[PDB]
Design a protein around this ligand. Structure first.
Ligand SMILES: Cc1ncc(COP(=O)(O)O)c(C/N=C(\CN2CCc3ccccc32)C(=O)O)c1O
Ligand SMILES: Cc1ncc(COP(=O)(O)O)c(C/N=C(\CN2CCc3ccccc32)C(=O)O)c1O
Ligand SMILES: O=P(O)(O)OC[C@H](O)[C@H](O)N1CCc2ccccc21
Ligand SMILES: O=P(O)(O)OC[C@H](O)[C@H](O)N1CCc2ccccc21
Ligand SMILES: [Cs+]
Ligand SMILES: [Cs+]
Ligand SMILES: [Cs+]
Ligand SMILES: [Cs+]
Ligand SMILES: [Cs+]
Lengths: 393, 266, 393, 266
């Protein structure tokens, strides 16, 4: 029994060991209560505005779309304190955690942006933060490991499995299984067991709400399409949510194509996986024929995850939202293009969203279209990784 | 009706059950089959057997490594069912319980899974990441194919959960000794007396305590608390891990442990 | 002959070779003209708002001042696109450069934040950017060298002299001497020859204007004091400017004390130097008895400069503004404190401003005071430098 | 009145001036004094001498390194004035011009600086980073102490500047061959005929071209353009740099160069 619907059509649920069900029910209750609480909302609002830096800018590109009839705006979540959209929802979850009398936070991280957000929120609001991060990501997203540790968070390298996000997720959940009484699990994406996909969306929805208000002011109408990368679905659903009932507005999610879908080394379960049960949810999974969970791959640590949030699987199934993939090389080109022609360094995750938007424009340059890319974060963390790759060429 | 018959025989003998767990195919199919025969011979009242899964979320490193050893041996769910059939052929009456993760059950159809279970002579299935709230198609398909669906009664169980576990489950109730994940080092200390009596009140399947049971004293304590018996997993698996290079000494040490654990159940 | 006053009392002027005087006069003319131009102002405004991310937040600290009667706000220039206040004025100067038909930019950098700002503005607005940076700073502020180069700027290591800001300044000016017809010298601070100190102040003054409006809304009154670090004086004068005629408002500048003023290894010419002529201006200089320019030292590359802007020397001489120093170790402690108790990673430059504000509070904890620290930038660039130091301990 | 006498003697002889520059104390005080005597002996009409400064903003690497060599030798402004006095003692009539940066002049008082200049027998001072706009206390203190204040006429000079340089300057006008900083490799190509005639019209002190003059052809061209002569700095200093280990060959190569450069001035 739950207060809210755990499912999005077939997808979602609460597939956790029985031991964690009361934790999840307590969290859902706290959330429903907080959402109705004007004091919680004012405090959340205050942190978002005066601490995080909201509203973020909506930037019109005026170089990269030259010679085409595409008008492109970037929603500047890269400008948010911490350097990614991740900060929005961790601030809400941290308030919920305190509201439930918890003094410790458990988080997983891949890009290290959620980690950094979990650490900064915990420093601010007086929580003891421990962070699980795959050994591979500790290395390829190193700047964020320094940032996290400087802010007093414990960072725990995970060497198991693919040594990436999936494996960090494993350890975080295993930990929480034994610590839920004292620790709140600050899940970093719109995935996992109910109520997380719902909570993460509601604590990210200001992205799309601001975008709507901003684009109306600048353009006098809604976007033709909003475009966002999909790691587990938080930034995309944050962008999409307020636009779902606006049927003219295309909703486009971009999964990591990795080295190529045909290689199997990708992170695109929504379009190239198969429904399964894992990480607390029934959702599209990369899995073997036997039902073992496949390891994913992406150049982008924040997208390198073999599953995806249930509301996206849902929104796709009914054809409300459309999902595509962009490869490493496509994402890199878009990374370079933004750097050199708009003076903005995007996260390699965000670069996937931009790459597809650039494809939309390039494929049909005389098609009149007003596009918004959610620039989920900045690429300071990717600096060395990108350098090492380009040098190797 | 292997669980019903066992608990009837054990109560008649004023005795608790000892249930060892192993991962099927750890460290290889041949040695694992030998391991299982040794577990029975040393006095296992029932067996809990794991199908190697890629991401065992309810498991600490000991069993995590049991899954990996099996995978290193190339062990598949399909080869596990060949083993089970072979095990059932040799031992017609011992209850056999499976420890599953949901995806392995759901993968090629929940009904198809339980039908195969029955086909090979499995008696029960525990799905670690399927709480009572999500169990409907699982427990229905189980019952359809004369398999007992197993449910965990956690230390933080409220009354409504207790009554759900009592009604939904069959064969045995899994009485969880503590929060956390599997592990022989982490021992459950919290008294379970309150839960056992409530489960007996609601006519739940006989309770077996599991998680952190690695010594005969914990088996006896479990029995004296009113439980129908005790389950040891990580403790068993640690002997496999420790004796990988000494296959004969492995079975020797396993026999000693099971025999000691079973003695304390009396 | 000039349109505007080149001097602040005794300080300022235009001490350049005669060859560069027409460049400076052209620049002053372009500036006076642009300032009166509603189209220039609207475009500048647009870039600041929709591209840079202004207004920046004014964040109330609610941990670090616990147990004291100090209320501390941070003006969040660390949230600005690029990651420092530097971005404000480079966007104005870049527009001026285009307005003067220039297609190339020359800039010096120390922290690499001005460099990054000059590179990003040049990418955006279509200028060819070359950047002079001392070899020492290339190393201790490496993240910014990657950032600059990714954005298509040429970065030129300077090995001459102290291999820091001073020496980068030398090379930039020497370059401009031979390229002024095609290249605009985007000076990075409120120093150098007229009209730069005046232009940089006017293109940074929004910091103090926003701060004023923000503090009035939150507190119903002006600050007791605004506090800012002084490298060459841009962020401080940006903060100070709108508060100069508010005589109740204390204006406090913080010079790098380095290893200790008594060591001679510091960057505090305003309080511990001597008026001289160099870098196009008559200003406080670190100089030998013979009148040779001394090399400065600071842990902070952006403050490691043996001189200071003329308006600060002026504002000090008349006792309008007060100047102090903070050492490396003081700045580091403040760096750690903000990281761990407010969840904000400041630049080591900014940390000097914060350190003094923390001293104001700690020295007299029962003194009721409302303080604003200009948090000029974020400390992503200092991450490894700070780590290497703390590890060595 | 050494400049007045020199230009009178040169015009009488239908001849242009050759003015070599060196940094005082490069590579050491002794060798530098020898260098200067060799420059004169080989036919220098006047001398331009630099006081080692920490940050020479109008100088390319060649002279940058001349300043550094001097500093490596421990050369101070005070030791430079000892040299000048010694140079003037030996050569009573040769005009001596100083190349200064402002801070060295301003340091212990502008008046004090020019008074010392006079005391040692210096004839002119060029302050590289003091444009006509900032020159008032500099040119006043110069004139007070019978020193010629020197001003640069750049290629981008307008009429108002020209008239300012003509009125404010004395001894000689510094005619800048090109924008940029000092350097023998970077040669000025832009015609200066327009500036020379305007300076003559406004009765400016005789013009000497400087910056990038490193060959006799450039000296002659300068003279034929109507200039009173040519200044070579970096070219001279490069011979010092090249022959640091061969002190005798240095003076030999310097004599050859100056002699060749002076010949072309006739
Ligand atoms: C800048 C940036 N942009 C996009 C994403 C992708 O995540 P979405 O949730 O928006 O789809 C990231 C992701 N970064 C991280 C990984 N997160 C946190 C936990 C998690 C589980 C499963 C999938 C994705 C995530 C991270 O920073 O930890 C990003 O940084
Ligand atoms: C984040 C941050 N905060 C303060 C300062 C100090 O400069 P102010 O001009 O605000 O006093 C910096 C400085 N960073 C740089 C050095 N700048 C640019 C050119 C220059 C000449 C003389 C003195 C200071 C500077 C830089 O990023 O290049 C900073 O980054
Ligand atoms: O391994 P220990 O002794 O802690 O007991 C748990 C045991 O492993 C268990 O019976 N079985 C095996 C893996 C697993 C996962 C969830 C629930 C039960 C089990
Ligand atoms: O060195 P070159 O031949 O380019 O000519 C310039 C010469 O160096 C000059 O007369 N003198 C020495 C250094 C300097 C700096 C500014 C103006 C004049 C000089
Ligand atoms: Cs903002
Ligand atoms: Cs366009
Ligand atoms: Cs994914
Ligand atoms: Cs306080
Ligand atoms: Cs300074």
């Amino acid at each position: 029994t739950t207060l809210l619907n755990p499912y999005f059509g077939e997808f979602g649920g609460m597939y956790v060991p029985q031991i964690l069900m009361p934790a999840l029910n307590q969290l859902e209750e706290a959330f429903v209560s907080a959402q109705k609480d004007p004091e919680f909302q004012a405090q959340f609002a205050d942190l978002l505005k005066n601490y995080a830096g909201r509203p973020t800018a909506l930037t019109k590109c005026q170089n990269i779309t030259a010679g085409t009839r595409t008008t492109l705006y970037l929603k500047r979540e890269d400008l948010l304190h911490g350097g990614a959209h991740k900060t929005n929802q961790v601030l809400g979850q941290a308030l919920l955690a305190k509201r439930m009398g918890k003094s410790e936070i458990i988080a997983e991280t891949g890009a290290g942006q959620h980690g950094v957000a979990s650490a900064l929120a915990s420093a601010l609001l007086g929580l003891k933060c421990r962070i699980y991060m795959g050994a591979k990501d500790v290395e390829r997203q190193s700047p964020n490991v320094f940032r996290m540790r400087l802010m007093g968070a414990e960072v725990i390298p995970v060497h198991s499995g693919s040594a990436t996000l999936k494996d960090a997720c494993n350890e975080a959940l295993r930990d929480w299984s034994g610590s839920y009484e004292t620790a709140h699990y600050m899940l970093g994406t719109a995935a996992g067991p109910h109520p997380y996909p719902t909570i993460v969306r509601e604590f990210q929805r200001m992205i799309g709400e601001e975008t709507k208000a901003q684009i109306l002011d600048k353009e006098g109408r809604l976007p033709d399409a909003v475009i966002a990368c999909v790691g587990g679905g938080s930034n995309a659903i944050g962008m999409f949510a307020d636009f779902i009932n606006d049927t003219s507005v295309g909703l486009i999610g971009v999964e990591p194509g990795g080295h190529g879908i045909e290689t199997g080394e990708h992170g695109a379960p929504l379009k190239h996986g198969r429904v399964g049960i894992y990480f607390g949810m029934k959702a599209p999974m990369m899995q073997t024929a036997d039902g073992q969970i496949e390891e994913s791959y992406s150049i982008s640590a924040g997208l390198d995850f073999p599953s995806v949030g249930p509301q996206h699987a849902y929104l796709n199934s009914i054809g409300r939202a459309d999902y595509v993939s962009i490869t490493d090389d496509e994402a890199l080109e878009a990374f370079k293009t933004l750097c050199r022609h708009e003076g903005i360094i995007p996260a390699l995750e965000s670069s996937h969203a931009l790459a597809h938007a650039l494809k939309m424009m390039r494929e049909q340059p005389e098609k009149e279209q007003l596009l918004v890319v959610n620039l989920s974060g900045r690429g300071d963390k990717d600096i060395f990784t990108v350098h090492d790759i380009l040098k190797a060429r | 009706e292997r669980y019903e018959n066992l608990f009837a025989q054990l109560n008649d003998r004023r005795e608790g059950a000892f249930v060892p767990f192993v991962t099927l195919g750890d460290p290889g199919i041949e040695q694992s089959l030998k391991i299982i025969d040794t577990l029975i011979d040393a006095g296992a009242d029932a067996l809990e057997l794991g199908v190697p899964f890629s991401d065992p979320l309810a498991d600490g490193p000991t069993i995590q490594n049991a899954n990996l050893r099996a995978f290193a041996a190339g062990v598949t769910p399909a080869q596990c069912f060949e083993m089970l059939a072979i095990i059932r052929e040799k031992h017609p009456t011992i209850p056999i319980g499976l420890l599953m993760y949901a995806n392995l059950v759901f993968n090629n159809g929940i009904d198809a899974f339980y039908a195969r279970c029955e086909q090979v002579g499995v008696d029960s299935v525990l799905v670690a990441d399927v709480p009572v709230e999500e169990s409907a198609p699982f427990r229905q398909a189980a019952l359809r194919h004369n398999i007992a669906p197993i449910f965990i009664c956690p230390p933080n169980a409220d009354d409504d959960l207790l009554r759900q576990v009592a009604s939904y489950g069959r064969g045995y109730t899994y009485l969880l000794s503590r929060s956390g994940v599997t592990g022989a080092e982490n021992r459950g200390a919290l008294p379970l007396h309150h839960l056992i009596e409530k489960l007996k009140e609601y006519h739940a399947a006989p309770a077996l305590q599991g998680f952190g049971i690695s010594s005969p004293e914990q088996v006896s304590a479990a029995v004296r608390a009113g439980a129908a018996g005790a389950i040891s997993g990580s403790a068993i698996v640690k002997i496999i891990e420790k004796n990988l290079a000494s296959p004969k000494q492995m079975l020797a040490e396993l026999r000693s442990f099971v025999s000691a654990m079973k003695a304390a159940s009396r």
